[PDB]
Amino acid sequence: AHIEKQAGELQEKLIAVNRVSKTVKGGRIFSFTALTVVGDGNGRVGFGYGKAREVPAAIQKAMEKARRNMINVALNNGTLQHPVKGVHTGSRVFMQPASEGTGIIAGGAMRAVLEVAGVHNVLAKAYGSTNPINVVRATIDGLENMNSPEMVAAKRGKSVEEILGK
Amino acid sequence: ARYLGPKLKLSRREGTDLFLKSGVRAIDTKCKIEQAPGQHGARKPRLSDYGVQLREKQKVRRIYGVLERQFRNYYKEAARLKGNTGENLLALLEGRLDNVVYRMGFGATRAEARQLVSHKAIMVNGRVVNIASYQVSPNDVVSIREKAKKQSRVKAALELAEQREKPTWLEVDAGKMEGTFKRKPERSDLSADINEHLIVELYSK
Amino acid sequence: SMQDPIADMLTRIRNGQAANKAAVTMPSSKLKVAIANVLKEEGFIEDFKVEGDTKPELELTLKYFQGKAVVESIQRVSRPGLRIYKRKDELPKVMAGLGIAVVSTSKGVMTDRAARQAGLGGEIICYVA
Amino acid sequence: ATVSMRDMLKAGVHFGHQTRYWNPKMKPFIFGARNKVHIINLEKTVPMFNEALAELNKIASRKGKILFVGTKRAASEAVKDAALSCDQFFVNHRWLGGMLTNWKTVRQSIKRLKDLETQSQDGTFDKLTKKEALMRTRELEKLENSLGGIKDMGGLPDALFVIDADHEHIAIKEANNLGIPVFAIVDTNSDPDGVDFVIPGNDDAIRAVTLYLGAVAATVREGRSQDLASQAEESFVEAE
Amino acid sequence: DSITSQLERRVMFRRAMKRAVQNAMRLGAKGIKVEVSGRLGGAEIARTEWYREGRVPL
Amino acid sequence: ATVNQLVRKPRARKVAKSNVPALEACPQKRGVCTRVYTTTPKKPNSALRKVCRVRLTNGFEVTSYIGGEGHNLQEHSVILIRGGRVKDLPGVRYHTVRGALDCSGVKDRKQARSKYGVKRPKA
RNA sequence: CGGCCCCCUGGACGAAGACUGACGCUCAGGUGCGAAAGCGUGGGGAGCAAACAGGAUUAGAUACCCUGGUAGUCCACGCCG
RNA sequence: GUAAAGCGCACGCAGGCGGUUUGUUAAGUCAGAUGUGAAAUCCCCGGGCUCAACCUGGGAACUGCAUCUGAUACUGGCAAG
């Protein structure tokens, strides 16, 4: 269904896992939940929360929901250089234009999420729901173009077709 | 100021011997350390962003034979003479008189080495300099005060050390009880687990 | 009445791309013309013409030669009401240098690069995003 | 290649049958009503159709196999006429939207059909009791109807031919994910999707749709015959 | 025996039972049903699990 | 809204960084105990928990929890108080400093001695 | 704002002839303005109806459901709209 | 919109804002010109007392101010469209 960036070989960064219930006679819930962010170890889009009858299916649901069945805004190369704010399904991440590479600091499990996402180069504060199941959206709302490549000639990139169109 | 006390405990998390208590008991062998220490070890531990920062500050406190409090002044000097902060801080950590003393061999442990500083057995420029935090630069000379050139324990430590604790950035002579420190190293020569730019991002915000 | 015709200029380009056009025509200021030239040489618009009825009027051609790719929105920051002025040294490259400010200097309208190399300040008109 | 333009006019002269209401997103290719019946602009569709029918020709040397999707209770007979081969595959009446990503299941039911079709056809379907044997005949029927447009297809198709964009939103998603391009024929009261190439057109009554699909198929189908005959001639030259 | 052995030594029971089934049907079972119970997860109260695959008619 | 609009209409603001009440702009303050209450709290989780009202020496009166460990407080004793709300207990904006004055904890110690109390038993 | 119309008159909606030419936009302050009942004084009260009476309902019945029945509902202008 | 939060509504002066063109001006705009901005403990570059803490010479954002000269690309003033 939903198409994503390039990768070669994938890392199943499971950041969190949980269990749901509402057990009763006839129709019931008894499954497990799992949360994974999928990437290549530098920068890729993809985030999936899924659930199933047991722990093996729970994780396979989650890895499918990252890679398909999910709306994302795209990335190019494993680095950011279009730092801007945004909103996707209430979740707000703000990034002011500053240095690339160095300055990276974010608490709890989030510094590890940012390394597979490609936006550990430029980053600033989060607002809206502050839970690690929904704020991993960094490379989506915090990137409002479909490519943000590492050559600074990116701002001449669309220009070279526009003045040839003149 | 030499901390010690509950000394081995911090190595027992760390999996490096931290240079404290070497010999025949640096990482395991007669040392009982991470060979199921205690009466527990079945449960899953948890980490955070502050957990890897804390672990890496713990590493760097003991490997240079310093403290958190010593390392705060080392940063107050690192910013004042400006560059890349993490680079500057290590130059100063590795620039301690206790670390020149340690790498030359004159004590084969952090506690030994710093003791020979403090207890006036170490001289810089032929005058006794009893401060481990004394700054030492390339082609400077360390030498031993007279009433301490009779140490049996000095002679013993240099030979335990012989071409297994002695680095190539220095020279020493085990007969004259004196040496020239020829070059201050950086992280490319040393161990590459410790990181001091990440620790300044923590203390700045 | 609308107070700002230059917010309208931008809204014309945005909605222009969204409605899958290739051209957008409007009533023109002297200021509008002076703006459209910096955009055209900076390659965020493709072309324009200037033509008369009862006053001067600007017709322009979109970045729908290639659609959307780095710029998805263009907005003016020194408008009617809120104005902000920038000195010769603090003229910015918006989005960590993946962009420009269009800058009205006391020499005329040019981009932030050229105003800064000349060491000329002024009123900061519009950014790409 | 004026030949594409003949077929578009020859099909297009049913002038619609549906009311003066149309899909807003199709508006460019729609001419004004005559007494509450929708009429497509016939001239404005003839430039599109020639661009489409050359693109179908280029993929004939890439082609694996074709899959006619968007089938339903009125569009099937029009797909029947289009295929003229088993180099190109189809179903008659209905289609289950999506096969491209749950291929795992789909190949597992093809193996259940052909095993139990061979038992039925030998006369050796009868085991345990007669109740059980009839119960298996009843599942053989069920498979055949579920499978008819894939039960002969060698894997996954190199292009996808969709007449109905309207129940096929899930198939188009999955096909693109498998890295297959869609070639589409969309109605004037249907919404166009995320597809790679379109024929703008009006699919009212059986007389228009059999020809649009037939024109689409000729370019690609006889391309395919000629690329394969060439593979014979590139090897046989050596031996002559 | 093999699925209690994992649980006795607190290694696994979420997938230990599924490899039992895999290993069973490859030598000749048209189907196997498994139920695991105990004090599973180190919990101060009792839990259950189950898994059926292929056919087990009664 | 406009930016101009907001100069003409001032914003409503609160402090997002302080909410626990505190007297004389400091972390500790002294008062004499007046009363003790055995009380049952907010939430379906219930104990007969022990709290004091204390009369401060700076002219206010507050109710504080006896924290740390045990109940060892007298009903009229000058004791040291610390800001810190102990949630579901009635009117509790404060806790009592177990290592100061008349307060002391119960049974040995492996915890603090600032709160939980008792002189040195171990390192 | 509800039968429909006229008399007075506001406001909208189209279109040709013709006319002025930013006379624009927004709006602290501001004056002006009622769905309903309430309401000051006047007209009106056929039916319905709060209360009050009494039934019926029910682990009780102020709620539920009923009957009588007064103010009210109905008009005109006015008062913080 | 519904989470706390659109004035109950019109009309509109004061303040804020100003389609499009010319003339004219220059409040804010920016550039230019020049003076001021002690002192380290802060900051940047040096230095010394066993390093350090500590203290410090030179430079400084001195996070602060000053007015003339020049400009009309911008908005504001005023005149006729």
Swiss-Prot record, chain B:
Pfam family, one: Ribosomal_S4
Domain S4 RNA-binding: 95-155
Keyword Transport tagged: no
One GO BP annotation of this record: transcription antitermination
Keywords annotated in UniProt: Antibiotic resistance, Repressor, Ribonucleoprotein, Ribosomal protein, Ribosome biogenesis, RNA-binding, rRNA-binding, Transcription, Transcription antitermination, Transcription regulation, Transcription termination, Translation regulation
One GO CC term on file: cytoplasm
GO terms of molecular function: mRNA 5'-UTR binding; mRNA regulatory element binding translation repressor activity; rRNA binding; structural constituent of ribosome
Repressor keyword on record: yes
Transmembrane segments annotated in the record for this chain: none
InterPro entries xrefs: Ribosomal_uS4, Ribosomal_uS4_bac-type, Ribosomal_uS4_CS, Ribosomal_uS4_N, S4_RNA-bd, S4_RNA-bd_sf
Job description of the protein: One of two assembly initiator proteins for the 30S subunit, it binds directly to 16S rRNA where it nucleates assembly of the body of the 30S subunit. With S5 and S12 plays an important role in translational accuracy; many suppressors of streptomycin-dependent mutants of protein S12 are found in this protein, some but not all of which decrease translational accuracy (ram, ribosomal ambiguity mutations).
Family: Belongs to the universal ribosomal protein uS4 family.
PANTHER family: 30S 40S RIBOSOMAL PROTEIN, SMALL RIBOSOMAL SUBUNIT PROTEIN US4M
Protein name: Small ribosomal subunit protein uS4
Swiss-Prot record, chain C:
Keywords, sorted A to Z: Repressor, Ribonucleoprotein, Ribosomal protein, RNA-binding, rRNA-binding, Translation regulation
Pfam families: Ribosomal_S8
InterPro entries in the cross-refs: Ribosomal_uS8, Ribosomal_uS8_CS, Ribosomal_uS8_sf
A GO term for molecular function: rRNA binding
Keyword rRNA-binding attached: yes
Family (UniProt): Belongs to the universal ribosomal protein uS8 family.
The protein's name in its UniProt record: Small ribosomal subunit protein uS8
Organism of provenance: Escherichia coli (strain K12)
Originating gene: rpsH
From Swiss-Prot, chain D:
One GO location term (cellular component): cytoplasm
GO-annotated biological processes: cytoplasmic translation; ribosomal small subunit assembly
Xref: InterPro entries: Ribosomal_uS2, Ribosomal_uS2_bac/mit/plastid, Ribosomal_uS2_CS, Ribosomal_uS2_flav_dom_sf
Pfam families the record matches: Ribosomal_S2
UniProt entry keywords in alphabetical sequence: Ribonucleoprotein, Ribosomal protein
Family under the similarity heading: Belongs to the universal ribosomal protein uS2 family.
Quaternary assembly: Part of the 30S ribosomal subunit, contacts bS1. Some nascent polypeptide chains are able to cross-link to this protein in situ. In collided ribosomes contacts ribosome rescue factor SmrB.
Function: Required for ribosomal protein bS1 (rpsA) to bind to the 30S subunit.
Protein name: Small ribosomal subunit protein uS2
Encoding gene per record: rpsB
From Swiss-Prot, chain F:
Domain of life: Bacteria
GO cellular component, one term: cytoplasm
Cited CDD domains: Ribosomal_S12
Claim: Thylakoid is one of the keywords in the record: no
Subunit structure: Part of the 30S ribosomal subunit. Contacts proteins S8 and S17. Interacts with ArfA. May interact with IF1 in the 30S initiation complex.
Entry similarity comment: Belongs to the universal ribosomal protein uS12 family.
Keyword Nucleotide-binding listed: no
One biological process term in Gene Ontology: cytoplasmic translation
InterPro entries, per database record: NA-bd_OB-fold (IPR012340), Ribosomal_uS12 (IPR006032), Ribosomal_uS12_bac (IPR005679)
Name of the protein described by the UniProt record: Small ribosomal subunit protein uS12
Organism: Escherichia coli (strain K12)
Coiled coil feature spans: none
Pfam families referenced in this protein's UniProt entry, alphabetically: Ribosom_S12_S23
Disulfide bond sites: none
GO MF annotation list: misfolded RNA binding; rRNA binding; structural constituent of ribosome; tRNA binding
Record keywords: Acetylation, Antibiotic resistance, Methylation, Ribonucleoprotein, Ribosomal protein, RNA-binding, rRNA-binding, tRNA-binding
N6-acetyllysine found at: K107
Function summary: With S4 and S5 plays an important role in translational accuracy.
Anything else known: At least 19 substitutions or deletions in 11 codons can promote streptomycin resistance, dependence or pseudodependence; all but one of the streptomycin resistant mutations (K42R) are associated with hyperaccurate translation and thus reduced translational efficiency. The streptomycin sensitive allele is dominant to resistant alleles.
3-methylthioaspartic acid: residues carrying this PTM: D88
